[PDB]
Nucleic acid binder design. Structure first.
Ligand SMILES: [Mg+2]
Lengths: 507, 136
DNA sequence: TGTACAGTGACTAATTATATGTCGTTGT
DNA sequence: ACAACGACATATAATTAGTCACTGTACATCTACGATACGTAGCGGCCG
DNA sequence: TGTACAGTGACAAATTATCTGTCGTCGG
């Protein structure tokens, strides 16, 4: 290869040598050039042989030949190899696994071996630091390494399969994951609840935020189903959100890309994906999915750090007043966060581009305007019970609840596919297999509960209590084990009440 | 000044885009360089002595005839192409009264005591502009 | 006036690759 | 006779190991645990 | 090619207290 070297910051001594060399650039004659050397021996206080060496160092190296080169020992240690290997490997072994041995502690191991070997000059602690110095800088550098980024309109998302998804247009690849927000919220009475969970759905091509879910609720394939319908459907917000632009963003993904959480690697999201026709894809590392993750730092920096009750990004940065200074309810935080996403965030510049907004790039990036799906057809969100069988008397029994259906007595002994809503299990949609296809059969209803609404976590909590209470299984008996615990509080029920009040304001 | 010196010294190798007819064949280290510590370092690095008239013809034969002549649009690159074409195929192909037979280029060539050997490109890196800090 | 250990500027001693003379040798 | 290069000896700051006074920051209850999913096994009721 | 917002080097322009001329005034 090519091998060049250039001098810099030359002057401090070297300008005197440079002026000597400038006076000597030409062998004018054998008589005169010797006189020029013997004259230069007045500017440098040195013999003819020192000036002849200077001229040879200049002619063979150029300007660096004026500068004094560093000694051959620079960076080598005089303590001998035994001690240099003992010190290096002792450090490394002592920082193996969970151990975090300090150089001082390494020096103690040096004095201990020197005592065993009857040495008299075990390296001093100051020299231990020096010997370990280079392998500490490396560690600090290896943490600090920057990565460039996608540049221009071309983007290839890596999966856990080693396949890359080429992101060609708007709604080609959506992405999703969850996080805690960093604000403690209060109930409608001003008492502490908990820090909400935020879900975001993003389109990869435009980086526009295509939908959210905010709530005290837990990450679940239900919260993902709700984030999906909010992303897919056309969006409506009332004047109490004070929006000055529209979240005009909707339609159905071709692919959905996620971390490996049990919300996403689930049969429920598989069934949603098969019915909507989108393919579920797995993120290979957290560092591949920055389009999901980075909305979250921006929101900490642009929104949540400026709100009362802020908790910091971690426990070492927690404002000590966070538990006393909380003020917002979930309905206030959503009314702030939705505004932020519609008026600010989707209207800001797409950073890869510099000359489009995130929304402008999404809208112009559709291959065609997609048709709005009917709100009833989002019943593909309903969970599937795969292999329950019809009992004689036209009956289905399910999470203790017993169901009756309009044609269902025709199919006693047969196997049926049941589609249901975890928010309301009073009613079941019954499908059956015919010609190796599902066909709709009937809207079965929990007998004697046709006037009544049970969510699955209520029927489940009532069943747990009923099992442990030792009472019999029936549709009312389960309702009886709800209505007391309803009427008679526990943080999850208090959270659920505030979350419900937000869902009411959605209607 | 150091960038103008670098060009002068190195081989030219201009692109097809300049649509030149003649080759700009000069290259090489001088014995002296006259100018308007840095240039004196460069002189000491390269081995020549630093000391501390085409303009009449550039005005009359080129620049007074161009778009935007300050008494239409023209980019810096276009002006360079025009300037090089003028230099390589006209100005250095001209014959002065004191030369008679030979052009500015031919007399240059004709007067060399020997064909110099090209300075490898890297030895001229000291001329180029510098940004002092970047992170890999 | 919390409290005491590990890391850090500031200075010094031992070791060494390096700059300087001086002379011998060779080329011009 | 003048200039350049090597042999040999001699003095020298750069480098490293060591010592010392001043200072930074942890000790001050605290992440194993909660919330989802799948995958497999079990309990008695109903039928042969 | 992970990612995108806030903080940070590097450079340019308008404003003002500060340094320089030139002259006038006063003292030795
Ligand atoms: Mg995740």
């Amino acid at each position: 290869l090519e091998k060049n070297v250039i001098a810099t910051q030359l002057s401090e001594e070297a300008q005197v040598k440079l002026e000597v060399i400038q006076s000597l650039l030409e062998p004018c004659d054998r008589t005169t050039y010797g006189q020029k050397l013997r004259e230069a021996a007045e500017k440098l206080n040195v013999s003819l042989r020192t000036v002849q060496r200077l001229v040879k160092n200049w002619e063979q190296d150029g300007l660096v030949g004026l500068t004094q080169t560093s000694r051959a020992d620079k960076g080598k240690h005089r303590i001998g190899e035994f001690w240099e290997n003992f010190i290096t490997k002792t450090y490394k072994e002592g920082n193996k696994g969970s151990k975090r041995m300090t150089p001082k502690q390494v020096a103690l191991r040096v004095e201990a071996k020197a005592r065993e070997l009857k040495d008299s000059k075990p390296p001093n602690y100051k020299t231990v630091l020096r010997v370990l110095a280079p392998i500490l800088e490396k560690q600090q550098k290896a943490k600090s390494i920057r990565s460039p980024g996608w540049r221009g309109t071309t983007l290839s998302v890596k999966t856990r399969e080693g396949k890359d998804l080429s992101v060609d247009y708007s709604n080609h690849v959506w992405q999703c994951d969850h996080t805690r927000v960093d604000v403690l919220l209060v109930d409608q009475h001003g008492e502490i609840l908990s820090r909400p969970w935020l879900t975001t759905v993003i389109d990869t091509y435009s980086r526009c935020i295509m939908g959210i879910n905010l709530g005290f609720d837990a990450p679940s394939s239900g919260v993902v189903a709700l984030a999906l319908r909010h992303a897919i459907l056309p969006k409506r917000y009332g004047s109490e959100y004070k929006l000055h632009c529209e979240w005009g963003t909707y339609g159905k993904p071709e692919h959905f890309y996620t971390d490996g959480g049990k919300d996403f690697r689930s049969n429920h999201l598989s069934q949603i994906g098969a019915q909507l026709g989108f393919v579920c894809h797995l993120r290979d590392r957290p560092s591949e999915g920055g389009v999901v993750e980075r909305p979250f730092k921006t929101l900490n920096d642009q929104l949540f750090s400026t709100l009362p009750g802020y908790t910091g990004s971690n426990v070492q940065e927690r404002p000590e007043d966070a538990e006393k200074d909380a003020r917002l309810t979930l309905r206030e935080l959503e009314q702030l966060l939705v505004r932020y996403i519609v008026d600010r965030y989707n209207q800001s510049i797409d950073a890869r581009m510099g000359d489009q907004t995130r929304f402008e790039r999404w809208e112009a990036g559709l291959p065609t305007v997609p048709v709005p799906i009917p709100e009833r057809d989002l019943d593909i969100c309903l969970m599937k019970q795969s292999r329950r069988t019809v009992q004689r008397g036209g009956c289905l029994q399910f999470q203790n609840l017993m169901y009756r259906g309009e044609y269902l007595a025709g199919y006693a002994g047969e196997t049926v596919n049941l589609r249901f809503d975890p928010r309301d299990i009073t009613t079941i949609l019954v499908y059956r297999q015919e010609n190796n296809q599902e066909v709709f059969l009937t809207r079965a209803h929990a007998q004697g509960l046709e006037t009544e609404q049970l969510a699955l976590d209520e029927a489940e909590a009532a069943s747990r209590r009923l099992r442990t209470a030792g009472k019999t299984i029936s549709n009312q008996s389960l309702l009886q084990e709800v209505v007391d615990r309803d009427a008679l509080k526990e943080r999850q029920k208090l959270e659920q009440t505030v979350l419900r009040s937000a869902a009411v304001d959605e209607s």
